[PDB]
């Protein structure tokens, strides 16, 4: 995969499973145009988002749905999504994995970028 | 302070000094409206952004400028900004501190909400 | 303070208040020797640990007590403590702030080192 | 694998490759006893450390060598190791993955435990 997203639950120490994810690309007029979407697997991973020729140079946003993921805990989180923005391929053929560790009021994200 | 932002440099182990911060609020037409701005102090802190009256319920984005902060290192980061989005909910005015610990390809943020 | 410790609760979005903290210094025989202790304030901070004179060069461990901090949440955490190790003062005086963002199965810790 | 370790470089945005990992268990006399060791692969992952029979309930420390890892950056880190301590199985038996995202003056670590 040119783009893969992986999500972990830092409260229970488990993959975050069946969670919705939306991907956008910034367009000419400055709006976020819809690019790809899905739900995470049993390992907290979402594979198969895009193709090598669809994944053109530009700026991308990843939105992970969190509103009710912690409902069973009794806590409402800081926002309805966890989100990251990244700039891609100003420089060539590269593959990206976006990794997120999530809690209701805190998260850590990392972009791992490799040249095949 | 209804809203304070504090920024740490996780590569050199120090406050991030003199870095630009812009804050926005989501508007009627779904675009981001300019809300408040300033630059961090000697301690990495930014006070005085807004007032209890201007800071109504809604959805807010904090943008921290990182385009050149890493140059002397010889590394260009994952993106020209670090961005945090939060919802200010109920009833009921709260005070917010947004803390961000920054590296070129990673970041950890935390929102602390009191009252 | 030559040494200050600050603790945040990443699950509830609050300072972590009334939490026990232990500090140790490495000895010759390679055992950790007790060096200072206390409980955090209403701001999640612990001030007054040591003096400039007592805070000599060496290797230090900070232990934050977490066993039952999240009991009211229904979760047992990954360990009875969150711990950090650091190497101190190599040239001239330096002041340290150890900051920790805590959840049951994850944490983020940062050392901020400043020249007075 | 009953125990897997994975290491990421948060400064360059890549897996941490060929880095040394030593694992210990808290012994009778309260000292750390050597338990298992290895080096990370091209993916930043370390598999094959132990067996279901050897990995009994107890307290374990994972030590990641970082002394010379950012020398080429020009910075000396907060300490010569990154360390995680966890209690097992507590449980038992579960499978553990310890993930660490590393910078010179910071780190983030997460234990994922499955049955
Ligand atoms: Zn894939
Ligand atoms: Zn959604
Ligand atoms: Zn959002
Ligand atoms: Zn203030
Ligand atoms: Zn800006
Ligand atoms: Zn941006
Ligand atoms: Zn103090
Ligand atoms: Zn204790
Ligand atoms: Zn311990
Ligand atoms: Zn070694
Ligand atoms: Zn394996
Ligand atoms: Zn060590």
Residue found under tokens 């290895």: D38
State the smallest CA–CA distance between residue A8 and chain D in angstroms: 8
D1-31 burial, b at 16+ Cβ within 10 Å, e below that, comes to bbbbbbbbbbbbbbbbeebbbbbbbeeeeee
How many angstroms is it from C50 CA to the middle of ligand 7? 10
List the single residue in B13, B14, B108 with the smallest CB-CB distance to C101: B108
Phi/psi at C73 (nearest 5 deg)?
-90, -15
Question: Distances from the Cα of A30 to the Cαs of A39, A60, B22, B66, D58, in angstroms?
Answer: 27, 12, 18, 20, 55
CA of B25 to the centre of ligand 6 (A): 15
Chain A residue with minimal CA distance to D107? A108
How far apart are the C-alpha atoms of C73 and A48, rounded to whole Å? 36
Task: For domain B1-115, give the fold.
Answer: Immunoglobulin-like (2.60.40)
Kindly tell me the sign of the dihedral angle through the C-alpha atoms of D85, B99, A90, A26.
positive
Provide the residues around ligand 2 (an ion) whose CB is within 5 A. A 20, 65
3-state secondary structure of B72: helix
The answer to whether the CB of B14 falls within 8 A of the CB of B5 is: no
Q: Which two tokens stand for residue C83?
A: 């711990």
Cα D63 to Cα A25, A47, B52, C66: the distances in Å are 40, 32, 48, 21
**D12 contact partners, CB below 8 Å, separation of at least 6:** B75, B104, B105
- Residues facing C81 on adjacent strands: C65
Give the contacts of D39 (CB within 8 A, at least 6 positions apart): D18, D19, D20, D21, D46
Nearest to B45 by CA among B88, B96, B98: B98
Question: What does the domain layout of chain B look like in residue ranges?
Answer: 1-115
Task: Quote the minimal CA–CA distance from B55 to chain D in Å.
Answer: 33
Chains that touch A (3 or more CB pairs under 8 A): B, C, D
**Chain-centre distance for alpha carbon C13:** 19
Whether the Cβ atoms of residue A74 and residue B76 lie closer than 8 Å to each other: no
Q: After which residues is chain B broken (C to N over 2.5 A)?
A: none
Angstrom distance (rounded) from CA C108 to CA B102: 12
H or E element that contains D108: strand D106-114
Q: Which residues contact A4 (CB under 8 A, 6 or more apart)?
A: A45, A46, A47, A49, A95, A96, A97, A98
User: Shortest CA distance to D80 belongs to which of C87, C99, C57?
Assistant: C87
Longest dimension (CA), chain A: 46
Task: Find where tokens 């039952």 sit.
Answer: C68
Q: What is the CATH number of domain A1-116?
A: 2.60.40.180
Whole-number Å distance between alpha carbons of A69 and A66: 5
Give me the torsion for CA of D23, D26, D29, D35, rounded to 10°. Answer: -30
Q: Which of A93, C103, D99, A37 is nearest to B106 (CA)?
A: D99
**How far B111 CA sits from the closest chain C CA (Å)?**
6
CB-closest option in B59, B81, B109 to A107? B109
**Cβ atoms of A11 and C104 closer than 8 Å:** yes
DSSP at C24: E
Phi and psi (nearest 5°) for D79?
Answer: -165, 155
Going by C-alpha positions, the residue among A100, A88, A86 that lies closest to residue A46 is: A100
Number of cross-chain residue pairs from A and B with Cβ atoms under 8 Å apart: 45
Q: What angle do CA A49, B87, B56 make, to 5 degrees?
A: 145
The beta-carbon neighbor of A110 closest among B106, B111, B112 is B106
Contact between D108 and C113 using a beta-carbon 8 Å cutoff: no
What residue ranges in chain A does DSSP mark as E strands? 3-9, 14-15, 20-26, 32-39, 45-46, 58-65, 81-88, 95-103, 106-114
Buried b / exposed e across C14-40, counting CB within 10 Å, b at 16+?
ebbeebbbbbbbbeeeeebeebbeeeb
Report yes or no: D24 and D64 within 8 Å, Cβ to Cβ. Answer: no
Give one DSSP letter per residue of C31-91, joined into a string.
Answer: PEEEEEEEE--TTSEE-----TTT--SEEEEEEEE-TTTTGGGT---SSSEEEEEEEE--S
Beta-carbon neighbour count of residue D33 at 10 Å?
11
CB distance D24 to D32 below 8 Å: yes
How many other β-carbons are positioned within 10 Å of the β-carbon of residue A36?
Answer: 19
Give CA torsion, residues D69, D71, D73, D74, to 10 deg.
Answer: 150
Q: Give C31 Cα–ligand 9 centroid separation in angstroms.
A: 14
* Cβ contacts of D108 on chain A, cutoff 8 Å: 101, 108
Q: What is the rounded CA–CA span in Å between residue C64 and residue C19?
A: 7
Q: How many CA atoms lie within 13 A of D30 on its CB side?
A: 3
Residue at token pair 């488990």: A14
């Amino acid at each position: 995969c040119p783009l893969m997203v992986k999500v972990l639950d830092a409260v229970r120490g488990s993959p975050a499973i069946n969670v919705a994810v939306h991907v956008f690309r910034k367009a000419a007029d400055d709006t976020w145009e819809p690019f790809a979407s899905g739900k995470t697997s049993e390992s907290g991973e979402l594979h198969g988002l895009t193709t090598e020729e669809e994944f053109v140079e530009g700026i991308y946003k990843v939105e992970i749905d969190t509103k009710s993921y912690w409902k069973a805990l009794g806590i409402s989180p800081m926002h309805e999504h966890a989100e990251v923005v990244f700039t891609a391929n100003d420089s060539g053929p590269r593959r990206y994995t976006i990794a997120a560790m999530l809690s209701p009021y805190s998260y850590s994200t990392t972009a791992v970028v490799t040249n095949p």
